[PDB]
Scaffold this active site. Structure first.
Site, short mmCIF file in Angstrom:
data_model
loop_
_atom_site.label_atom_id
_atom_site.label_comp_id
_atom_site.label_asym_id
_atom_site.label_seq_id
_atom_site.Cartn_x
_atom_site.Cartn_y
_atom_site.Cartn_z
N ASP A 34 0.80 -1.23 0.00
CA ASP A 34 0.00 0.00 0.00
C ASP A 34 0.83 1.28 0.00
OD1 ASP A 34 -2.04 -1.86 0.19
OD2 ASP A 34 -2.57 -1.38 2.26
N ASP B 181 16.05 -6.95 17.88
CA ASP B 181 15.24 -6.99 19.11
C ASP B 181 13.76 -6.94 18.80
OD1 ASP B 181 17.47 -6.86 21.03
OD2 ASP B 181 17.72 -4.81 20.33
N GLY C 196 -8.83 -10.36 8.33
CA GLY C 196 -9.21 -9.68 7.09
C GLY C 196 -9.39 -8.19 7.32
N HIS D 112 -0.80 -6.26 16.22
CA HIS D 112 -0.51 -6.59 17.61
C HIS D 112 0.99 -6.69 17.82
CE1 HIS D 112 -1.49 -10.88 16.06
NE2 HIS D 112 -0.18 -10.71 15.97
N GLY E 145 9.63 -11.59 21.84
CA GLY E 145 9.50 -10.34 22.61
C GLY E 145 9.86 -9.12 21.78
N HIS F 43 1.57 3.11 18.48
CA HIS F 43 0.81 2.38 19.48
C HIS F 43 1.42 1.00 19.73
CE1 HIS F 43 -2.91 0.66 21.41
NE2 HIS F 43 -2.45 -0.42 20.81
N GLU F 44 1.67 0.25 18.65
CA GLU F 44 2.23 -1.09 18.78
C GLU F 44 3.62 -1.11 19.43
OE1 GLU F 44 0.54 -3.73 18.41
OE2 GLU F 44 -1.20 -2.68 17.57
N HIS G 218 3.61 -1.28 23.05
CA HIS G 218 3.56 -2.67 23.51
C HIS G 218 4.95 -3.29 23.48
CE1 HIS G 218 -0.73 -2.67 23.74
NE2 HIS G 218 -0.97 -2.74 22.44
N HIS H 63 -2.60 -1.77 27.38
CA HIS H 63 -3.60 -0.78 27.00
C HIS H 63 -3.99 0.16 28.14
CE1 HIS H 63 -4.47 -3.70 23.57
NE2 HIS H 63 -3.97 -2.61 23.02
#
Ligand SMILES: COCCN1CCC(C(=O)NO)(S(=O)(=O)c2ccc(OCCCn3nnc(-c4ccc(OC(F)(F)F)cc4)n3)cc2)CC1
Ligand SMILES: [Ca+2]
Ligand SMILES: [Ca+2]
Ligand SMILES: [Zn+2]
Ligand SMILES: [Zn+2]
Length: 164
Positions: A25, A59, A77, A84, A93, A119-120, A123, A129
């Site tokens: 994309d 890493d 989909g 995630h 990790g 955002h990811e 994590h 969250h």
């Protein structure tokens, strides 16, 4: 007796990442630009720094995939799950997976790769969250067009509680 190892925060301030593959994309350059800026979100408020590796074991391994893609947390989909990522640790990790059934963009249209990646990588660095609806780590996508980007206070306090 023993308990399981992990999980907290990276014991090193210089972390590496690898873009394993790319979405159709956006151009290679646009994807690279988006991830670099997404990491800069976190290095701008901590002593963390990030270097890109072109091959091998990093890493934080970043990849695009669809449906079941090698971790038994399958994507779904178009729409729904966007991506995630796993908290600090060995093997998986830090890794971040993006659903390539979404339309990824550099704009206010579709899903902004930079913002979702930011955002990811939260994590990837050890943040779960937030319950604050204004936080980057809030699990609902509401990114708009203009103007600049500021890491909300909740995320700043969260990441700084880990890395100072
Ligand atoms: C039941 O289990 C399922 C769990 N589920 C939760 C959802 C998912 C997930 O979180 N994965 O990790 S997701 O993929 O759907 C997903 C992925 C990423 C998302 O980005 C969230 C970002 C929230 N945000 N929007 N705008 C902003 C924002 C912040 C600051 C800002 O600057 C400002 F303020 F303007 F100056 C501008 C905009 N911040 C959302 C959803 C999947 C897993
Ligand atoms: Ca999806
Ligand atoms: Ca890894
Ligand atoms: Zn995955
Ligand atoms: Zn999330």
């Amino acid at each position: 007796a023993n308990v399981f190892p992990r999980t907290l925060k990276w014991s090193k301030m210089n972390l590496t990442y690898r873009i394993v593959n790319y979405t159709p994309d956006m151009t290679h350059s646009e994807v690279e630009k988006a991830f670099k800026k997404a990491f800069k979100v976190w290095s701008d408020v901590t002593p963390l720094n990030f270097t890109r590796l072109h091959d091998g074991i990093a890493d934080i391994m970043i990849s695009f995939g669809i449906k079941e893609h090698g971790d038994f947390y399958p994507f779904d989909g178009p729409s729904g799950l966007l991506a995630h990522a796993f908290p600090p640790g060995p093997n998986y990790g830090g890794d971040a997976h993006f659903d390539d059934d979404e339309t990824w963009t550099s704009s206010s249209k579709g899903y902004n790769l930079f913002l979702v990646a930011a955002h990811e990588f939260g994590h990837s660095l050890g943040l779960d969250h937030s319950k604050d609806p204004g936080a980057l780590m809030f699990p609902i996508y509401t990114y708009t067009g203009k103007s600049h980007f500021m890491l909300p206070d909740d995320d700043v306090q969260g990441i700084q509680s880990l890395y100072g």
